[PDB]
Amino acid sequence: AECSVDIQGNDQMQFNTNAITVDKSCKQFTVNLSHPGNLPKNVMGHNWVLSTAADMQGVVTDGMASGLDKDYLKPDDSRVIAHTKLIGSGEKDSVTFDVSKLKEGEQYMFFDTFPGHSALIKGTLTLK
């Protein structure tokens, strides 16, 4: 099975998927984030951040507190299972993480922690 997904986020504050399936036979999984807009990361930054569903709100709220210089993530946030960097227009970042961090049955969400953006950029991730 494939073990990677390509995701883009634009200047219009949306991602091109709200649902990712990670096949249980994958040992690692990769997400390739790109930003086809024209606006820079201080104005229209996007990241891809993964946590349990239960943990999403806190990661988003603490990340907003932390500011651009932290990529809008609380330092040392152990709720964050995996994430990309925060990227702007014309940039790309990939993250590859161990599928051993995920369990069949548990409920996960991916999301963008740039202020306001999780209102529209978020989705489920499932191990299947």
Alpha helix stretches (DSSP H) within the chain: 41-44, 56-66
Which of the ranges 34-42, 68-76, 94-102, 110-118 carries the binding residues for Cu ion, by CB under 5 A? 110-118
Tell me the two tokens of residue 108: 């996960």
* CA–CA dist 35, 99 (Å, integer): 25
**String marking each residue 30-69 x if it binds Cu ion according to CB under 5 A:** ----------------x-----------------------
71 binds Cu ion (CB under 5 A): no
Which of the ranges 34-42, 49-57, 103-111, 112-120 carries the binding residues for Cu ion, by CB under 5 A? 112-120
83 binds Cu ion (CB under 5 A): no
Which lies closer to Cu ion via its Cβ, residue 110 or residue 114?
Answer: 114
Residues 13-32 that bind Cu ion (CB under 5 A): none
Q: Which CA distances in Å does 124 have to 1, 19, 51, 65, 108?
A: 19, 5, 10, 24, 6
Among 29, 33, 114, 125, binds Cu ion (CB under 5 A): 114
The residues, any chain, with a CB within 8 Å of residue 47's CB and separated by 6 or more, are 33, 71, 72, 73, 83, 84, 85, 86, 87, 112, 113, 114
Binding site for Cu ion (CB under 5 A): 1, 46, 112, 114, 117
